[PDB]
């Protein structure tokens, strides 16, 4: 065939039941994750090719960045809770990796303010039960897929994308191979 285990995807020994259809894990500290999002725009291109009524979910992981990382996982739950993921994704990547201006929890909050989320709305979401559930939820899903690093993407709890078996001499070719694989898996 064109698509094969070992090549564009591997198959989990231990499928995950009731996993989201397409589940991406990342870290604002991860250079490969910054490459996926700021240079390759993996997310956007995958979305463009997902079959009808097939949504993508994105979770932040903790095993990078120490205590700042844990705050970033909670700040991400804030973003998921308020629906502002597309407003803070770029300034958080750049604050962490490019300018290294995010050193503490208040620098994270500043980015949300400058993106239109008012400070009291952020604080309230930050200390809310919904955010606590979403932090726990991100952590559970990482554990359920025995996550060891990021970036990673899983389709229907069964298949793990294998970028390293894709062609990386042309970035645009890589991106369409990645996106097309995710489409192929959604329907497998």
Numbering used by the authors: 1 to 188
Manuscript text:
DsbA from E. coli K−12 (EcDsbA) was the first and is probably the best-characterised DSB enzyme to date. This 21 kDa periplasmic protein is a dithiol oxidase that catalyses disulphide bond formation between consecutive cysteines of unfolded polypeptides as they are translocated to the periplasm. EcDsbA consists of a canonical TRX domain, a hallmark of proteins involved in redox homeostasis, with an inserted helical domain. The TRX domain harbours the conserved active site CXXC (C30-P31-H32-C33 in EcDsbA) that is featured in many proteins of the TRX superfamily. The acidity of this groove originates from a cluster of negatively charged residues (E24, E37, E38, D44, E85, D86 and E94) that map along a buried channel in the interface between the TRX and helical domains of EcDsbA.
The other three mutants, E37A, E24A and E24A/E37A/K58A, were crystallised in space groups P21, P212121 and P2, respectively, with four molecules per asymmetric unit. The E24A mutant lacked the water-coordinating carboxyl group of the glutamic acid, which abolished the hydrogen bonding with water w3 and caused additional water molecules (w1’, w2’ and w3’) to occupy the space filled by the glutamic acid side chain in the native structure. In this structure, the K58 side chain shifts towards the E24-vacated space, and this change disrupts the proposed salt bridge between K58 and E37. Overall, in the E24A and E37A structures, although water molecules w1, w2 and w3 were still present and coordinated to the remaining charged residues in the channel, the number of interactions stabilising these water molecules was reduced, with the E37A mutant also resulting in the water network being less tightly connected to the bulk water (bw1/bw2). Water w4 was not observed in the crystal structures of any DsbA mutants, which is consistent with the relatively low conservation (42%) of this water molecule in the wildtype structures. E24A caused a 2.9-fold reduction in the initial rate, while K58A resulted in a 1.9-fold reduction in the initial rate. Intriguingly, E24A yielded a rate constant of 2.24 ± 0.14 × 106 M−1 s −1, almost identical to the wildtype. However, the double-mutant E24A/K58A yielded a rate constant of 1.47 ± 0.06 × 106 M−1 s −1, 35% slower than that of wildtype EcDsbA. These results indicated that E24A and K58A did influence DsbA oxidase activity, but its individual effect may be too small to be detected in this assay. Intriguingly, the effect of individual mutation E24A was undetectable in this in vivo assay. Cell-based assays showed that all DsbA mutants except E24A significantly affected ASST sulfotransferase activity in vivo, consistent with our in vitro data.
